[PDB]
């Protein structure tokens, strides 16, 4: 039993394997906004849009 337990000990005393985990977050924002306000105002003859 001593010897068998020794073998189990050999199996158990194994280095735990570390891994480097690299998770990367990428955010991309593209924004194009165009606004045109066209104005025609005359109070001389009261025509104004």
């Amino acid at each position: 039993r001593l010897d068998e337990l020794r073998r189990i000990v050999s199996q158990l005393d194994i280095p735990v394997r570390q891994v480097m985990i690299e998770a990367r977050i990428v955010e991309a924002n593209v924004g194009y906004d165009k606004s045109l306000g066209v104005r025609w105002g005359g109070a001389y003859h009261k025509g104004n849009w």
């Binding site: 105002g41 109070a43 009261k46 104004n48």
Partner: protein, 49 residues
């Protein structure tokens, strides 16, 4: 007066009278006004929409 873009220029004439023109009306047939500055300013702002 309108309703979608309501307009009742009778009160606008009141505002013009506040501006300072001479309005005289002794009967429904007879009326007359002079020195009215209400149309160019009152119409322009009121009708800006």
């Amino acid at each position: 007066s309108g309703y979608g873009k309501d307009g009742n220029i009778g009160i606008k004439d009141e505002d013009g009278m506040n501006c300072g023109p001479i309005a005289g009306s002794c009967t429904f047939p007879t009326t007359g006004t002079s020195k009215s500055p209400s149309p160019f300013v009152d119409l322009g702002a009121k009708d800006a929409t």
